[PDB]
Amino acid sequence: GDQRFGDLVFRQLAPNVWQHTSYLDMPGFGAVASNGLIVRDGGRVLVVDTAWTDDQTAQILNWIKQEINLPVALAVVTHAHQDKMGGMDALHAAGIATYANALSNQLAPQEGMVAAQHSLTFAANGWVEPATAPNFGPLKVFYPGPGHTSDNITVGIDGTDIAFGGCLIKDSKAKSLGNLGDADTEHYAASARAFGAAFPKASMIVMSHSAPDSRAAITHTARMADK
């Protein structure tokens, strides 16, 4: 299943969907995996999240060229931390249009990230304002509320059973939500449940720091945020 391509790993999840995985030695935590997505929509490719670094992100684009060989129309990144936004400059160097929550772009400089070119804004109910996500094809973008960070967003893939929780969701047997340094501890639990309710038919939950899991990942995350 897994395909090793340099120091990255790619796994097909559905006919038009792949998970990209990249690793960063975080002193004190080991070599930490981070997952994002690659989606083919007809004659173009859409990317969810960068890798940790520009070099790794360029390797994602090289893998796309080899395995899909269609242009990358856009990328959307799911919050202003390095695992999701660390490779922005590589996307820009490649000419790819980039999108993030407006709040992620606001936070990017202080978090050490390069901002995306375009800002997404969200309705009161959490769904992206459609004019801010033009030409997103099957990507359905949802702001569940503050949790892992104030800016975290999530993405469903229409035509599949897949929803991507990014760093908000941990798998059903995880033991910790992380260090919570940037987390909204008051609202985290509600935000996790809101993600599940926004994508109620998704049976494959993809997330940044666990392999894909069933919907049990959402309720386990939500219970731990209760603490």
79 labeled binding residue: yes
Out of 14, 135, 178, 186, the only residue in the binding site for ligand EEO (CB under 6 A) is: 178
167 labeled binding residue: yes
- At residue 181, φ and ψ (nearest 5 deg) are -65, -35
Query: Which CB atom, from 21 or from 208, has the smaller least distance to Zn ion?
Result: 208
Query: Which CB atom, from 147 or from 196, has the smaller least distance to Zn ion?
Result: 147
Q: Considering the complex, what minimum distance in angstroms separates the CB of residue 12 from ligand EEO?
A: 24
CA distance linking residue 76 with residue 24, whole number of Å: 21
Q: Quick check: 224 binds ligand EEO (CB under 6 A)?
A: no
> From the CA atom positions of the chain, what is the Rg in Å?
16
CA distance linking residue 98 with residue 61, whole number of Å: 14
Out of 48, 60, 72, 81, the only residue in the binding site for ligand EEO (CB under 6 A) is: 81
75 bridge partner residues = 47, 98
Q: Quick check: 179 binds ligand EEO (CB under 6 A)?
A: yes
Q: Quick check: 167 binds ligand EEO (CB under 6 A)?
A: yes
Taking CB within 5 to 8 Å according to partner kind, which of Zn ion, ligand EEO, none is near residue 29? ligand EEO
148 labeled binding residue: yes
CB atoms within 10 A of CB 59: 20
Out of 41, 49, 54, 83, the only residue in the binding site for ligand EEO (CB under 6 A) is: 83
Strands (E), 89-176: 97-101, 118-120, 139-142, 154-157, 162-166
Q: Quick check: 82 binds ligand EEO (CB under 6 A)?
A: yes
Strand, helix or coil for residue 212: strand
201 labeled binding residue: no
CA distance linking residue 94 with residue 176, whole number of Å: 37
Nearest by Cα to 13 from 215, 158, 217, 212: 212
Nearest by Cα to 162 from 80, 32, 48: 48
Taking CB within 5 to 8 Å according to partner kind, which of ligand EEO, Zn ion, none is near residue 6? none
Query: Which CB atom, from 162 or from 169, has the smaller least distance to Zn ion?
Result: 169
Contact indicator for 148, 177 with CB cutoff of 8 Å: yes
Out of 7, 11, 23, 32, the only residue in the binding site for ligand EEO (CB under 6 A) is: 32
Piece of 6-14, 76-84, 88-96, 157-165 that binds ligand EEO (CB under 6 A): 76-84
Size of the site for ligand EEO (CB under 6 A): 9
The DSSP secondary structure of 3-45, one letter per residue, reads EEETTEEEEEEETTEEEEEEEEEETTTEEEEEEEEEEEETTEE
Q: Which residues are annotated as a binding site for substrate?
A: 170, 179
Per CB under 6 A, residues contacting ligand EEO are 29, 32, 81-83, 167, 178-179, 209
